[model samples]
Target chain A: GMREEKIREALNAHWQASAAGDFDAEHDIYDDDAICDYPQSGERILGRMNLQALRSHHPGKPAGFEVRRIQGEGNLWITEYSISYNGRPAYTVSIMEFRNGKVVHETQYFSDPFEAPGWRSQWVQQIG
Target chain B: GMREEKIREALNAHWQASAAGDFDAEHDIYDDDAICDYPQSGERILGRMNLQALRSHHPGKPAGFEVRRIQGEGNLWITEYSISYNGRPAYTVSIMEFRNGKVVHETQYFSDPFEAPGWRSQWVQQIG
Candidate 1:
């Protein structure tokens, strides 16, 4: 379980740095030639620098960031978290594939929270 | 290898049923007491029947459904695919956790395509 322990450590550091707005430390978890894909934007960033540049140039940092769960094995890891920019929380999922203990490729998905439909209320539980 | 192959086969069948609108067959891959979470809607569906009922009541089916990639090991599997309604594609990520060869829980995220910002064009490649 050494590999699992090591990757978990790396992931914790990466997310902690991200929550702190420490871009330099955050990008350290990725390879210099890493690829990051934004499926929503239909674009693939070719390197770690490009990925860092895009995030660094963001309009505003999230007012809140929380990692709800992190789980995976071997070379793949998935993080389920939420980020709120101005009180409105957006659920996010990150799938990272690591090589040599550094993320080589990642695909992230972001979705805004919405009210649950009334029809399924009978067999569902609302989460806060 | 046997476990991976079996899960892969189950995934293929599940998605195929989904695309064909075969609710019964589609629901078969999931456990009778499976839990499905819609993070974006802040709702957790409690059972397979509820999950199937919700989907069966959907107003429309996607005009196109395609599985881009599927990967995982052991009891965890992730599927990256796109489903289009009226020709506008929505990227989807499904993280399914298996128990005894059946999906015990799943977390799915859906995202619509958007125009990539011009700023990162220099270091990005557009994907279709």
Candidate 2:
């Protein structure tokens, strides 16, 4: 019950950070040596520098990401969410590994450009 | 890597237990106060007694349940499996909660009778 409640809070923090484009908040949540895998990019970005590079590409604007499901076992938390960025729909699955109440690793699976729709399509087209 | 591998091992054990119909094995994996929720049954069976009751209803024969996906973060393990019992397909999503290397609690979300298909249909028809 304690773990469940804790994960719920952590997920809430993650959702807030993504929705508000709070890079600092996002960075604080993940480990310094974290690695991320974006299903859309089909690439694995490891360490803080690479993670930061991936985040830098973001438009730094609120995307209205909403958490649709939050599930966990022990120290692991998986959150599935739907995002509307600019104007297209995008789905993301974030697998977070936590240690001592902080995230030690995170892997993100996101939809590709071809699959992007609605608000997401608008963001990519306008930004590109 | 250690945590990931540990969780993986735990999941494998779980799969083996379910496949073997080892009630003791199954019982050992769950927390004493664990609560199981069957979406189809629309009931929350809690504690070892309740869980045992739920398991006892099983045919106790190998059902050929195969794990389709095993995803985890921290101490949580979410497994999606398809089962073939008698010859219809049945989908199961197991949300396991762990504590101290044992399943402290588990909640299962399984389809209702109306949703059961393939092998599941055959099993239910024959058994019921």
Candidate 3:
């Protein structure tokens, strides 16, 4: 069994890769046949190459992102955070699956915090 | 033992109640201390009263809704459907938790079909 520090390092590496727009590093972290299920869209983004395609076309700048919370349980890690093109809040929760000290799969759920109606919009918009 | 038909009946009844905007029926279905987790928001909407308060202020009507699929796995029921306010599709996944022949908790994830970027917007918008 791997220690918590190892897991933390792996998760941090992923965040750093994403924040730096390093597609090669991010692609290397995933398993070849990973499946990314977008729950809101009911869409399954399959394979590492497809994930790269999605990331490559992202409209936002990477430096405007921040990871607020990172927690892991066994082989699963969850990162809750916010992103922006310039400064508009784009909230996201990323759940990653690890295998043998490497991230094998990641599923992300993202939404514009300003668009959600009621208290939900308010709460997510305020998060760092 | 309660049959699958009974379970389905209960599920349909709950949907009917929701479609009719019957807050009392909806409230009666939930347990006293139900926990509604909005995974994306990281918010827990608790108790029946709070649920009622949220529903009471809904900005949309019930007429433009259609339940496309309702499936049950033991006591858990998942209802996938589309709602509209003047025919603008709003996609939602309502996961209802049941206990002792009644719904104990209901958590809903909703998004506007028009606003979702990329293929997500296309898929949700095309659903009937």
Candidate 4:
């Protein structure tokens, strides 16, 4: 329970920080040499300062961050959420690796919402 | 080590099934009443049959499936991978919830790779 609660608290704060567009708040939670990777882009931004600046100037205007899940039993945490851009929604899953209470490494994957093929809608139910 | 090994086996087989485009192989690991949700689509496909039919009719041809990581401490397994279409790359994070050694529920988020703006490139390195 000790590691579980700590991870939840760290991730919840991260979600809140994202919603507020507070890069500094988000930066404070990572170690000075933390590594952040975007698996889709095959990009890795190393060091806390770089991530801080990169996110500070991030192009996406994320509003109404909806966190769907955040849970972990060890030093790994996975957070699933949707970030709204104006009205369009882009989903994101951030997997954070923690060491001694601070994030040491993280991988953030982003996805945009698209209409399902008409063929499959009959078998699918619209849900969040 | 025991739970970790089990999760790796389950996730690896799941990834292999996805790469081979083997719907039945993928479907077999899930419970009969399994729930599969796509975060980007805001849609839920209930039951293993629905998911089975899904990969059978999916439009994309995933030729190369590159798994980034898979790890968990308990019944929760998170898998990160990039599935290439022709040459375009799309990333996916699948969070699987298991009960009695079978997946009971899962949420999969998908993302397409895009070029990072030049401004951030100074601090970012390309890595998988």
Ranking the candidates on DockQ from highest down gives: 1, 4, 3, 2
Worst 10 residues of 4 chain B by lDDT: B54-63
Q: Clash totals for all models, in order?
A: 0, 22, 0, 0
lDDT of model 2 at position A127: 20
Better model by TM-score, 2 or 4?
Answer: 4
Q: Which residue pairs show collisions in model 3? A: none
TM-scores, all candidates, are: 0.94, 0.47, 0.54, 0.90
Deviating ranges (above 4 Å) for candidate 4: A60-63
Candidate 3 structure quality by residue, lDDT tens digits, A1-128:
55657888767887787788887776776788777756555566667877677767766236577887675655656676777776666566666777776666665556554333465443222221
Per-residue C-alpha lDDT of model 4 across residues A1-128, encoded as one tens digit per residue: 47678667777887788888888777788989999988767789999998888777775348667888786767778888777767877677888888888889988887888877688889999985
lDDT for model 1: 0.86
Model 2 residue B13 CA deviation in Å? 1.7
lDDT of 4 by residue, B8-121 (tens): 787788778888887777777899999998867778999998788777778534878888778776788888777877787777788888888899999988788877667778
Best by TM-score: 1
- Could you tell me the lDDT of residue A124 within candidate 3? 28
Instruction: Specify the highest-DockQ model's number.
Output: 1
DockQ of 2: 0.07
Local accuracy of candidate 1 as per-residue lDDT tens digits, A4-119: 89999999998888888898998999999999888888789888988888888884356799998898978989999988886877788899999899999998888877778887
Ranking by TM-score, best first? 1, 4, 3, 2
Q: Which scores better on DockQ, 1 or 3?
A: 1
| Best-to-worst ranking by lDDT | 1, 4, 3, 2
